[PDB]
């Protein structure tokens, strides 16, 4: 029926009054559609016929949704919803299946007219005033006012939940075992009692709601596994995602590609291996809602391989507060990483990927920790704890790494996983100089205007070289030069630059970079037996580079 629930008080934004939008007369087929409906509502106490001076009005549309006999009244609240105070927002947070515990048998109810069974702050009805058209005669100010949560208003969702929550409470206390989840119009109820008993408790709760005026349009439970919830399919030992159909056009626009990454990322919750760097890379400054964008061999291939991973299904299992939580990571590519978290081998709870933001250059050790962090933050959300990490990196590679790394950091204890490819330091720089090794005073500059520049070196042995560079930056050259050096040097060497810039890009010891040139250097570094990099004052204090600055 209706409800004995206390109402939640409401009010409009400070210094704002109710909406006064008038009605757009229409098909008297609809003016007669509504009238019927409104009557069935007022006879139900939902709506309330009002008087003369309730200034406020809000448009009421009436659409007989296509391929259905009945009509459904529709009130457009936009205005009130702009005049309504803000609420503690309706849990936007959705639980992740991988975090749902167990329960041998679940029932899903359907509190539909639900919102229409919860009281509406008395003093707040005024503003719900709406009117349905007078067939052009007798001037009907056929005016009705709402006495419940109008299926359109702002504080409707939240207030429903609150109201619902307060409701369950009593029932909840007599069955501290039955766990119930509410969200929108659903109410998932689950038990550890055989269908016999369990159904008693569902039928039970059922009436319990009914004494609260909450009518559940289900003689039995209209539950139909698997459950089609928030983009997932819910089963009795498996949870997965709903059909992820991946398009294939001869031409892709920005919104084309977007919707694609989307379906991809989401699919990545359980389809181990989904890559997406290349695709998304396409959408850059890509603020052109509808502008064709040619894919790249890279994008097509990933897209390909993604189609390949999708062609065969994969289920995810639920959770055991009793067993452990383990997460492993494996490297799969262009600075792309994938992972999966499980309690027992060969089944998963969920899976996921990880690539670096548009950040200049990275490194394997840095990146793997970055993944571990992401997994950690995620784990606290889903499970409320941190998993045991099994990682493909020797503990000595990481200490030599975290230890010498200028930035704080703390990764819980992991466990080495021989499963290559391993995460290793492809190289290290001599902290201390090199005796006997040639010393190169490296440099490169460019006219910040003419776009031109040159890179070249000078040695202790008297060797020198300058290479012409066009369309470059005072930057790309400072590296150019370092690179020129590494090129001509021998197995061992001492380079010296005026570029804290270049100094620091190499200093960090990257292995992968978006910048082909750096990758260029990264190559060479590998080969060197011992490389020592040093930074003397860029310009002024003109020491040994005093001579590379001029003829470069």
Ligand X SMILES: Cc1cc(C#N)cc(C)c1Oc1nc(Nc2ccc(C#N)cc2)nc(N)c1Br
Q: Are 339 and 98 a contacting pair, CB within 8 Å? A: no
Neighbours of 94 (CB within 10 A): 11
Contact range with another protein by CB under 8 A, out of 32-40, 294-302, 305-313, 432-440: 432-440
- Sequence length of the chain is 552
SS3 state of residue 508: coil
CA pair distance 202, 224, nearest whole angstrom: 15
Nearest distance from C-beta of residue 393 to another protein, angstroms: 17
CA pair distance 24, 474, nearest whole angstrom: 66
CA pair distance 106, 202, nearest whole angstrom: 10
CA pair distance 216, 109, nearest whole angstrom: 7
Give the footprint of another protein on residues 496-525 (CB under 8 A): 496, 500, 503-504, 507-508
CA pair distance 315, 317, nearest whole angstrom: 7
Give the footprint of another protein on residues 367-426 (CB under 8 A): 370, 373-374, 376-377, 380-386, 402-404, 406-410
Please give the structure tokens belonging to residue 215: 């009518």
Give the footprint of ligand X on residues 95-134 (CB under 6 A): 95, 100-103, 106
Nearest distance from C-beta of residue 206 to ligand X, angstroms: 17
Residue 535's nearest CA partner among 523, 549, 545, 525 is 545
Is residue 478 annotated as involved in ligand binding?
A: yes
CA pair distance 17, 11, nearest whole angstrom: 10
Q: Which of 4, 9, 15, 243 binds another protein (CB under 8 A)?
A: 9
Residue with tokens 């069974």: 117
CA pair distance 329, 340, nearest whole angstrom: 7
Give the footprint of ligand X on residues 239-298 (CB under 6 A): none
User: What residues have CB less than 8 Å from 160, skipping those under 6 apart?
Assistant: 114, 115, 118, 149
Contact range with ligand X by CB under 6 A, out of 39-47, 223-231, 422-430, 515-523: 223-231
Q: Which of 181, 402, 416, 427 binds ligand X (CB under 6 A)?
A: 181
Residue with tokens 């010393």: 439
Q: List beta partners, residue 491.
A: none
- Residue 165 or 471: which CB sits closer to another protein? 165
Q: Which of 202, 234, 442, 469 binds ligand X (CB under 6 A)?
A: 234
Q: List beta partners, residue 181.
A: 188
- Residue 84 or 269: which CB sits closer to ligand X? 269
541 binds another protein (CB under 8 A): yes
- Residue 71 or 405: which CB sits closer to another protein? 405
Give the footprint of another protein on residues 243-262 (CB under 8 A): none
Contact partner, 289, from another protein, ligand X, none, Cβ < 5-8 Å per class:
none
Contact range with ligand X by CB under 6 A, out of 226-234, 264-272, 406-414, 466-474: 226-234
User: How many positions of this chain bind another protein (CB under 8 A)?
Assistant: 73
Is residue 185 annotated as involved in ligand binding?
A: yes
Residue ranges in contact with ligand X by CB under 6 A = 95, 100-103, 106, 179, 181, 188, 190, 225, 227, 229, 234, 236, 318
Binding residues for Mg(2+): 110, 185-186, 443, 478, 498, 549
Binding residues: 110, 185-186, 443, 478, 498, 549
């Amino acid at each position: 029926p209706i409800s004995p629930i206390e109402t939640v008080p409401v009010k409009l934004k400070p210094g704002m009054d109710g909406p006064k939008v008038k009605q757009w007369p229409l098909t008297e087929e609809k003016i007669k559609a509504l009238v019927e409906i409104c009557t069935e509502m007022e006879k139900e106490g939902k709506i309330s016929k009002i008087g003369p001076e309730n200034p406020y009005n809000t448009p009421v549309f009436a659409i007989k949704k296509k391929d259905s006999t009945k009509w459904r009244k529709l009130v457009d609240f936009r205005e009130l919803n702009k005049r309504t105070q803000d609420f503690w927002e309706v849990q936007l947070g959705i639980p992740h299946p991988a975090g749902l515990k167990k329960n041998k048998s679940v029932t899903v109810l359907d509190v539909g007219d639900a919102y229409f069974s919860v009281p509406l702050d008395e003093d707040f009805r005024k503003y719900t005033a709406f009117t349905i058209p007078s067939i052009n005669n007798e001037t009907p100010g056929i005016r009705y006012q709402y006495n419940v949560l109008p299926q359109g208003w702002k504080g409707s969702p939240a207030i429903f939940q609150s109201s619902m929550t307060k409701i369950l409470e009593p029932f909840k206390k007599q069955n501290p075992d039955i766990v119930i989840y509410q969200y929108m119009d659903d109410l998932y109820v689950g038990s550890d009692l055989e269908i016999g008993q369990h159904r008693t408790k569902i039928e039970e709760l059922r009436q319990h709601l009914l004494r609260w005026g909450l009518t559940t349009p289900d003689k039995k439970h209209q539950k139909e596994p698997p459950f089609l919830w928030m983009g997932y399919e819910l089963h009795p030992d498996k949870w997965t995602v709903q059909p992820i159909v991946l398009p294939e056009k001869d031409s892709w626009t920005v919104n084309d590609i977007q919707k694609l990454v989307g379906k991809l990322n989401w699919a990545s919750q359980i389809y181990p291996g989904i890559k997406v760097r290349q695709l998304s890379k396409l959408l850059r400054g890509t603020k052109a809602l509808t502008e064709v964008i040619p894919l790249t061999e890279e994008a097509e291939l990933e897209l390909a391989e993604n189609r390949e991973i999708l062609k065969e299904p994969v289920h995810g299992v639920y959770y055991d507060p009793s067993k452990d939580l383990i997460a492993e990571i494996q490297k799969q590519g262009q600075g792309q990483w994938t992972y999966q978290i499980y309690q027992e081998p060969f089944k998963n709870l969920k899976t996921g990927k990880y690539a670096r933001m548009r950040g200049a250059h990275t490194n394997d050790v840095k990146q793997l920790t970055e993944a571990v962090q992401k997994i950690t933050t995620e784990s606290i959300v889903i499970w409320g704890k941190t998993p045991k990490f099994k990682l493909p990196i020797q503990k000595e590679t990481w200490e030599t790494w975290w230890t010498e790394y200028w930035q704080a950091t703390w990764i819980p204890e992991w466990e080495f996983v021989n499963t290559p490819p391993l995460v290793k330091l492809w190289y290290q720089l001599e902290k201390e100089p090199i005796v006997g090794a040639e010393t190169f005073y490296v440099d490169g500059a460019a006219n910040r205007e003419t776009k031109l520049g040159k890179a070249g070196y000078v040695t202790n042995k008297g060797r020198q070289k300058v290479v012409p560079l066009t369309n470059t930056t005072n930057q790309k050259t400072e590296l150019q030069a370092i690179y020129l050096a590494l090129q001509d040097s021998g197995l061992e060497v001492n380079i010296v630059t005026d570029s804290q810039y270049a100094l620091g890009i190499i200093q960090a010891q990257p292995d992968k970079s978006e910048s082909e040139l750096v990758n260029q250097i990264i190559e060479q570094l590998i080969k060197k037996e011992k490389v020592y990099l040093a930074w003397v004052p860029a310009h002024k204090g003109i020491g040994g580079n005093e001579q590379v600055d001029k003829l470069v």
